[PDB]
Every structure is written in C-alpha cells, then in structure tokens.
C-alpha cells in the first residue's frame, strides 16, 4: 500500500476539503491541550489558533491521500501548497 515518496503523483495543492479537515482536527487538538507551537497572540478560539498554525505551516500533521485501489500518499502540510 505504501506509495513511495519519490512516486507521489497527486495534486501539489491542498484541497479545500483537506484544509478543512486539517484545521478542524488540529484545532481540536489545541483545544485538548496539544502543545501550541506558535504565539497565542491573545486568541481564545482554538480554530483561529489552528488557522494561525496553518499560516506558519507549524502544524505537525500529515494528510494520507487515499487512492481507490488502496494505495495512499503521505503528504506533509509543509509541502502541500496551502492555497
């Protein structure tokens, strides 16, 4: 099932759905006391915090893009063109 990193063939861009799930799950982690890797800068909404974390790509999440075969491509946030 492991698509080799040299062989990843999918869209270099983060889909709106990918961005949505990343921001939701990571926000939920910050709201459950995941260590924040950026200045809280006053904020109280965990979702806006996760948005800041996306803006600095500090997010430590990986997207597993599935292919209907079952092969998948592990992509970092730090590479997938956020927008």
């Amino acid at each position: 099932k492991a698509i080799p990193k040299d062989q990843r063939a999918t869209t270099p861009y983060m889909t709106k759905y990918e961005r949505a799930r990343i921001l939701g799950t990571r926000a939920l982690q910050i709201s459950m006391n995941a260590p924040v890797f950026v200045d809280l800068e006053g904020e109280t909404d965990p979702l806006r915090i996760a948005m800041k974390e996306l803006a600095e790509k500090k997010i430590p999440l990986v997207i597993r893009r599935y292919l209907p075969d079952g092969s998948f491509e592990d992509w970092s946030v730090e590479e997938l063109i956020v927008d």
Binding site: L67, P68, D69, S71
Partner: protein, 107 residues
C-alpha cells in the same frame, strides 16, 4: 467472417464456437448495408493492445472489471471484433472539452 444472406440455422450457430482454432463471426448482409462507425454520434473506437491495456490498468490501479463496460453483442464490438477482456479506447468529441479520451472494457 461469415456473411449470411437471410439467416444461419441454430445448429450451425453451434458450429460457430466449435473451432477454438479460429474465431468465426456471423454477420447479417442486411446489417452490413451501413457502417455504423460512419455515424455522427459514434466517436472513434480504437482497439487497445495487451500492453496498452496492462499500462492502462496500472496507471489507474484498478481491476479490469472496474472499468466502464461495453456489451459483447454491442454492434460496435461486433464491428471491431472485440474479444472478451478487450479494452477499447473511445475518443469522443465533447460539447465542452473538445477531444476527450474515455475507455471501455468489453465483457
């Protein structure tokens, strides 16, 4: 290719499959009066090779049975002589994309 004039008897139709040495195809002399591949709604059907088929099945990571189907008794399958398993590439002109390449598996 066996072009009958009016009919072939079902007993002879039991002879049609009887020589796995060489395919036998029966055709109606009245149904040959027009080349359906002549028609404006029928895009270009191209028979794929065994290697172009194996490549197609690799690029999309899927089984043969998961492609779109073309019936074995489809007139166009009868024209091209499609055997079972044969994939045909259909180049159709689309009202939006222009030339568009689709595929069909003959099963």
């Amino acid at each position: 290719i066996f072009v009958y004039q009016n009919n072939i008897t079902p007993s002879a139709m039991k002879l049609v499959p009887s020589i796995p040495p060489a395919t036998i195809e029966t055709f109606n002399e009245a149904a040959l009066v027009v080349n359906i591949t002549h028609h404006e709604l029928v895009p270009k059907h191209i028979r794929l090779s065994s290697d172009e088929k194996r490549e197609l099945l690799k690029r999309y990571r899927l089984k043969e049975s998961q492609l779109p189907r073309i019936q074995r008794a489809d007139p166009v399958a009868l024209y091209l002589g499609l055997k079972r398993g044969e994939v045909v590439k259909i180049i159709r002109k689309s009202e939006t994309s222009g030339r568009y390449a689709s595929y069909r598996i003959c099963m």
